[PDB]
Amino acid sequence: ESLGAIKKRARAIERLLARDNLKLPANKQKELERELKAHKERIKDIEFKRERSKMISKYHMVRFFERRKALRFAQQLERRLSKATDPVEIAQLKADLHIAQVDIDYTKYFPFMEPYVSLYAQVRGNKDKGAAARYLHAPRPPMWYEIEKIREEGVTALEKLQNRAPEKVIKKVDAKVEK
Template structure:
């Protein structure tokens, strides 16, 4: 039976593979390769919701500079610098607000057109691999370049600017004379940026156009209420309560409580009550009686 080798008989570092040398105790570890970091093209701007806060700060600093005549020189210089910084922050915040609005507005159009351009690039790439003649290859390369520019246009068109569709509806795809509509101006700019390698800078470009003014809602004119003609006042002088009520019932003027019920039985009861009231009035106009049985 063979005996085990001692630790010293292993051969030392020569028995360890080159890829494992860094794991041997005492050997220095290789220095890590520095990561290639590209400088950030799009600087993070202030959030859109901070516009009102920045405006408030600008207003406070401006009022302090206008009202305080006896400010020390150093305090006045600090306020002026702060005012200039706040104004720059306000411009950046308003630009970010417009950018977020444009992204939300054209998100769906960009997505659908990017899917369509991607399918077209894959289809042309497959045809290019299957082509055999030189003329067909050259024609497919031209179409391939156009499709790649279309795809980059959907991805790297400036986010803070209005997006013009590459694939309009079939009715608006051609001019009046039947020719195809030309590509938008931004398409050629994307093609130029592809050659220069500055597509990311184009995507995050800040628009120089002024922010759109908010829409003013038109106030509706108040509707004219047609006034109902008031009923003519009735002459009720010399009449008792029953007579006045009977006169109102004859003219069709009722109280709010009585007008709610419009059934036939209710109207008959009203007529019957008016008749009974008239009879009682006639009886009251006769000779007075002491209530005796033999009164004539």
């Protein structure tokens, strides 16, 4: 069944309860309201999957580019480190490679249905190989700090966050259906 078919079955089951003429039993108005909700419910799951996909569709580009800049940093760094030998330089590369690797998972598992917060747009020059420190030493959003912790416990915990269903759009689609 398609969306318009479910919408029609529901607008019909209601126009039917409101139809006075027909004397409909005790039971068959119970069922007519059970059914009226199974359709209203399914119309929401559908409109939710829709709003979800509108979302991913919007931010996929900005997330994608950041995920690529991060990935170039994390690799630029792994290299300069397999070279470097001063314990203070090796400490600042380990430090920075961390920031890079958490950037990479931020752009991946930052929740789909929450508007994306660009790590890198604040950085002037975004429209050296130490110009990687301009981006890596910038402020991080509080989400980034969450991802830093939440990225232990495996990829399985990460995507729990990724698909997180914000009650902001729960209440948005629940409204659009019910009125």
